[PDB]
Amino acid sequence: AIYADNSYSIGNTPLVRLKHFGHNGNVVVKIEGRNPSYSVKCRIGANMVWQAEKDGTLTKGKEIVDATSGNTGIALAYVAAARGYKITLTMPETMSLERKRLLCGLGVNLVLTEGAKGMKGAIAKAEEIVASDPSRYVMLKQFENPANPQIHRETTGPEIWKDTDGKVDVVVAGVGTGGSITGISRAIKLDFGKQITSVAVEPVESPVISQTLAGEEVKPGPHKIQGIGAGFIPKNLDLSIIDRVETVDSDTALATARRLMAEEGILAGISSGAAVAAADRLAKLPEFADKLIVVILPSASERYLSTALFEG
Amino acid sequence: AIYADNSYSIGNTPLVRLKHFGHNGNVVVKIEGRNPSYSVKCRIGANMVWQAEKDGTLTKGKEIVDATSGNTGIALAYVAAARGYKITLTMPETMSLERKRLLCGLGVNLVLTEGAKGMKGAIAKAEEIVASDPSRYVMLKQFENPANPQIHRETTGPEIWKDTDGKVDVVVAGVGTGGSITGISRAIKLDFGKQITSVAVEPVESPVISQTLAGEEVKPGPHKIQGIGAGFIPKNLDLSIIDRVETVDSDTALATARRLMAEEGILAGISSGAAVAAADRLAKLPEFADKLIVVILPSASERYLSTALFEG
């Protein structure tokens, strides 16, 4: 069919079997780089806007606000352009140059926040922006807005179910807001009724989900896996549906993304490398050796040319 | 389904209706940025390799060669990585930095040629590379290889036919090798039997198709519309199925691509701006006012961050 604007064209991303990871093809990746603005967040950029329209919090003349590590911002930006809204976004200054320049090209009022404060800083700035003029702005707050996991429950999850003919046994996803792993897991476990293993991935440098579940002190840290590991437990992470948490270090994340490019011909972003490295570890345990593992690859390589991903 | 490697996932790109171009939605764009390596050329990178495999000119141990303005090279590069081939590519040194760095990341032996000589120079270099060791190399020669238009006849054309429910009246495409407009036109005109208007787009700065058809002296020239306007009539341009040639200047191409981003939320590359500008002109002629115009958008914005596309 013909989509009325770019926001309606979200999803229907392909599954590709990996040849140099996993064990005899038990690792398959979902290429979320193939989306309107080339990341998984295109889905929530669209649905958060649609939902706010539906419940009347977003109207003509209202200006969108949120905090992002980049991809959600780019997602909200193309949707704002497509559907006719002004938009302000906060983002840590340390995020990739590509994110900054693309946001500006999409017509965003971009507010860069202090690198040291990370997402908490960007979230804080967005809140004080909106508080300065509540009638002008609407913050869509991706870290707690239920419209985030809901679109993954409605689209991403069902796509996985259909394309695997219900054979998916494991889903592996890095956690930023938690929306992807949450919505996908609810779809497959609750809507299709299959008791899969849901695997959250986080940086070993900032393993706050692992620490939380272990009853240890939460100690966030710096890392290079752009897009995940926000340093706190986000509201859109449904801890209750997470069966397993896997930690991955930055170096191995980067090396794995380079391997995906050079060995599989898959133009993956950094967090895609982290997710596949975690999946590869599970895939080579005899307990998962004959299970079908589906891995979310959130973004594409060219959004990271200015990062350590293209070191060398 | 689950694709055995990334090359099999080509195509099935969406149609999106434009809101600020054309006349009441008679202009619809096909987003070829949504492909394995994020351009229309993913299709021919895959099929040229497959076809050479099938007729035995590409075997294990043979090294791929071709000349490119970038996207075909990136396309052949991911396919080479996915299917296990070494690859050398020539490309004019003046092409976008993103093309260079991505090719290197995909493991290409990249040979940059003199900017002044353009594609003719890159083609010349590829030929002398292969001639130095014919048993080592196979040049896939996208400018004359029939496997280029054939995959557009098999996939791109049929997709357009299906998604428009056979209502497509006009197809607008920039010409580099000519493969896209050729294969699409053959599918719709000859396979589905509908007498559409096929519109080739070229730079006004290098209007060699227009000059040729007019019986005027062919006078190529420099321009900024990366990917089209190679300065000669390529063998994969079937002049016989071209009903109309539209010329577009570089400035207007760039401005139109920026508009696509800022006003439609479509992350288009430069040649995408040229194609839409040509389509917009046809769309506002009463003779096409109630005809459905489908426009190929060959690539995505982030492949052009280092170009004039992000001037300002």
Ligand SMILES: C=C(/N=C/c1c(COP(=O)(O)O)cnc(C)c1O)C(=O)O
């Ligand atoms: C929070 C965002 N990051 C999402 C993200 C994620 C995590 O997705 P969830 O937010 O759904 O957990 C993984 N990989 C990349 C590259 C990402 O950009 C954001 O773009 O603002």
Ligand SMILES: C=C(/N=C/c1c(COP(=O)(O)O)cnc(C)c1O)C(=O)O
């Ligand atoms: C010749 C190539 N350029 C194809 C191309 C085209 C033209 O497609 P055809 O080769 O099918 O004519 C249009 N726009 C962009 C950005 C392109 O890269 C190449 O990548 O080597």
